[PDB]
């Protein structure tokens, strides 16, 4: 009968946490930012269009030099583009064509990809033989890989469909730390600017904050009503934004430990597939299933623009490190670069 | 205009594009099929008669087919099922016989039929284990299905010699059960092709080929704007 008393402990703890959170809140973010000037209309238009993929595109990632990017598509290819001249630098065939993510190392020497095969593959781009080879294959997950991010040339963090996140050591190919606590498929993760913490969004309408060293979960964030498909920190690393299937985006805080603002509109009824901030964090970008990409004023929740140029759903987007451009991938097998 | 290294880079890009064209020629010439079913379906027998993913390749009349069997994931499908939005067809195998296995198969079919990303994929339906059904019924579905009593074998039914009318009535009852939700929201966007198979059957591949042929005409009739 200890189940009942543990259940009571859990519910009273939830009650006291809710009480503390409500006590810590008196004024809304919109009420404070009611006086700052708006950003006006934001009219961005296509500057480049990268063709060459055969099927839909799941993942996309910018290099640290803000010029090279890598894209993954379900046909089994992995293409590295030169965004300034629309030149294909590399074309990498994959063993399994069901790829669902890709990442590009900050140093620029490696790329990673994974998917339904439950394997994260590391590719070497600077070999003396002149081609691109597979360096390590990371096994141990029992579900599809959904995201992966590099910390340096030797460490990578992956989130899989087995409700766990893991920290790998590329040299020895072993899991050093395993993060547990989610109850649904983990769909995406984002690394902090200082690379000390990271957040993950799962299919239980909750987000968690992890510590890389001790493998411990610091805070748990709730407020969404459905699955979470995207997440990204604010530039200063004290907030993050999530996009869910309930047709809303939300901004959370790490120090006040609660919700701050909701970005929703009455005529939007499709889910969100990707989010990203601008360099100064004033603009929040989101990709939807209705083929568009809205641009939100992060401090006022007013919509500011639309990037309507795609024929199918938008599956990935990202913003360069210098903030000069934004790229969007889509299920029609085209990338567009807006500015 | 351009430097020498820029010209060489453009040449490399064009070579890569040539390779991509050579690969596209192969990619467009193959058909991808997703094999799916319940745990006790008996899909091992079907695949024998013809890690994360188990793949099988075959060709008929020098036309190549890929058949995928996703069996290395958990039991939650709403997230990884979206990858297969561009396959030509979905092969659905059910064991036509404890808990009610038929109802969960029907619910899975209903969910697949109405998904916003799978509203265009046709379904090929295989009703397996007819011998099991015959030997079981000639000796409980009326309990699992009260509306079974007031059922009449269809006029266009084609019985097989040496088969009791009880068994064929059960078979066409199950087929009509699937077809009722098949045609509830079809809209001509996609269709369902039912078939009867057994443990010993060698021509299921021919049936799959014919159904894929039919699917390929309706997309070209709609592609070239004749319908």
């Amino acid at each position: 009968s200890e189940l009942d008393q543990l259940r009571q402990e859990a519910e009273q703890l939830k009650n006291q946490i809710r009480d503390a959170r409500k006590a810590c809140a008196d004024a809304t973010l919109s009420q404070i930012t009611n006086n700052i000037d708006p950003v006006g209309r934001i009219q961005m238009r296509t500057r480049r269009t990268l063709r060459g993929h055969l099927a839909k595109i799941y993942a996309m990632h910018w290099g640290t030099d803000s010029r090279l990017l890598v894209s993954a598509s379900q046909d089994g290819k992995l293409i590295i583009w030169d965004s300034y001249t629309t030149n294909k630098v590399h074309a990498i065939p994959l063993r399994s064509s069901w790829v669902m993510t890709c990442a590009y190392a900050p140093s620029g020497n490696y790329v990673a990809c994974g998917g339904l095969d439950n394997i994260c593959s590391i590719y070497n781009l600077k070999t003396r033989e002149g081609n691109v080879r597979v360096s390590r294959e990371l096994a141990g997950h029992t579900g599809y890989l959904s995201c992966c991010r590099f910390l340096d040339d030797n460490q990578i963090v992956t989130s899989s469909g087995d409700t766990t996140c893991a920290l790998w050591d590329i040299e020895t190919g072993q899991q050093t730390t395993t993060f547990t606590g989610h109850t649904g498929d983990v769909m995406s993760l984002s690394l902090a600017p200082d690379t000390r913490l990271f957040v993950s969004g799962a299919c239980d309408a909750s987000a968690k904050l992890w510590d890389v060293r001790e493998g411990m979960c610091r805070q748990t964030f709730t407020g969404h009503e459905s699955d979470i498909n995207a997440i990204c920190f604010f530039p200063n690393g004290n907030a993050f934004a999530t996009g869910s299937d309930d047709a809303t985006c939300r901004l959370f805080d790490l120090r006040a430990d609660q919700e701050l603002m909701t970005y929703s509109h009455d005529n939007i009824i499709c889910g969100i597939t990707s989010v990203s901030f601008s360099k100064s964090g004033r603009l929040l970008l989101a990709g939807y299933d209705d083929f568009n990409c809205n641009v939100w004023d992060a401090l006022k929740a007013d919509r500011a623009g639309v990037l309507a140029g795609h024929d199918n759903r938008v599956s990935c987007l990202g913003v360069t490190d210098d903030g000069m451009a934004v790229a969007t991938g889509s299920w029609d097998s085209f990338l567009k670069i807006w500015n | 205009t351009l430097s020498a290294e820029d010209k060489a880079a453009v040449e490399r890009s064009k070579m890569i594009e040539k390779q991509l064209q050579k690969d596209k020629q192969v990619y467009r010439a193959t058909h991808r099929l997703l094999l799916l079913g319940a745990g006790e379906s008996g899909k091992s027998t079907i695949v024998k008669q013809m890690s994360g993913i188990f793949e099988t390749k075959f060709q008929v009349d020098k036309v190549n087919f890929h058949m995928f069997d996703v069996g290395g994931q958990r039991d939650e499908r709403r997230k990884w099922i979206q990858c297969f939005n561009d396959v030509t067809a979905i092969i659905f195998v059910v064991a036509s016989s404890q808990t009610n296995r038929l109802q969960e198969a029907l619910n899975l079919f209903k969910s697949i039929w109405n998904n916003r990303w799978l509203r265009t994929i046709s379904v090929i339906l295989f009703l397996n284990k007819q011998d099991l059904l015959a030997e079981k019924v000639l000796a409980k579905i009326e309990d699992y299905f009260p509306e079974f009593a007031r059922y009449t074998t269809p006029e266009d039914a084609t019985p097989e010699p040496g088969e009791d009318p009880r068994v064929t009535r059960a078979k066409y009852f199950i087929r009509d059960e699937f077809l009722r939700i098949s045609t509830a929201s079809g809209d001509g966007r996609h269709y369902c092709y039912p078939h009867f198979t057994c443990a010993v059957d060698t021509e299921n591949i021919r049936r799959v080929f014919n159904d894929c042929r039919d699917i390929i005409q309706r997309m070209h009739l709609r592609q070239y704007e004749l319908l």
Epitope: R67, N87, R128, G130, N131 | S3, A4, E5, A9, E11
Partner: single-chain antibody
Framework: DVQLVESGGGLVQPGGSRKLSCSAS????????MHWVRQAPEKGLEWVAY????????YYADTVKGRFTISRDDPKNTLFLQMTSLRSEDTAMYYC??????????????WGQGTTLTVSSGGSDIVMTQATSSVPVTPGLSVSISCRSS???????????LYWFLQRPGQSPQLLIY???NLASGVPDRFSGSGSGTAFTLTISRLEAEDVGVYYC?????????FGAGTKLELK
């Protein structure tokens, strides 16, 4: 390991013909452009010919235009140079050089060993100038090498196409710096490249006995590619 071995040299009479072959083993040969560079008996380097990947582009120097033919055979990893009507100015030792071009690559990174060819006795090109020819030096201190070009090498896209090579006594040339500021792979970091426009400078810090040889500057802005006279370092 990367290995370029070549053969076909020897003695020949004026006006004859001969074929040179370069055998490549250890890398993806079909993805690399290939160059031929020759070494006069007591002179500097000289560019001869170039064939791109896929044989879609070929260039020749003026001195050998119309008499030399370059070709490659990808399936068996071999590079050919066909020479006709040999003269007395062609007596040299010929090198086989690989090169790959994409954003961020390092061309002219690996060189062959060379084959000696001896022949019995019978206007708008960019001029690269290395004024100094010999510098006496002891190990320990810093050295500076200056190269100057007739035309400015700074392209509009922001790249400056200048390369540096070092040739130890009795060995093949080895790449040091590419595009004025980039260190080659597997090269000590005490080297540094600098310059602007038409004046260039390479600096050696903490010189040792291993840095004794001849240094050449090359431009890659336009074909034909032209080298410098070469500057020699003598060990005290």
């Amino acid at each position: 390991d990367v290995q370029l071995v070549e053969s076909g040299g020897g003695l020949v009479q004026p006006g004859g013909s001969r074929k040179l072959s370069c055998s490549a083993s250890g890398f993806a040969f079909s993805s690399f452009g290939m160059h031929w560079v020759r070494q006069a008996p007591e002179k500097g380097l000289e560019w001869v010919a170039y064939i791109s990947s896929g044989s879609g582009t070929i260039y020749y120097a003026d001195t050998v235009k119309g008499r030399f033919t370059i070709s490659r055979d990808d399936p068996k990893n071999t590079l050919f140079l066909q020479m006709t009507s040999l003269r007395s100015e062609d007596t040299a030792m010929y090198y086989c050089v690989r090169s790959i071009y994409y954003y961020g690559s390092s061309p002219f990174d690996f060189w062959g060993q060379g084959t000696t060819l001896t022949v019995s006795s019978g206007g708008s090109d960019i001029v690269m100038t290395q004024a100094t020819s010999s510098v006496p030096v002891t190990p320990g201190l810093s050295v500076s090498i200056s190269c100057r070009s007739s035309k400015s090498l700074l392209h509009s896209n922001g790249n400056t196409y200048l390369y540096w090579f070092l040739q130890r006594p009795g060995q093949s040339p080895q790449l040091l710096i590419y595009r004025m500021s980039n260190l080659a792979s597997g090269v000590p970091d005490r080297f540094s490249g600098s310059g602007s426009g038409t004046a260039f400078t390479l600096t050696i810090s903490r010189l040792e006995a291993e840095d004794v040889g001849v240094y050449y500057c090359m431009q890659h802005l336009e074909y034909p590619l032209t080298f410098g006279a070469g500057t020699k370092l003598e060990l005290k």
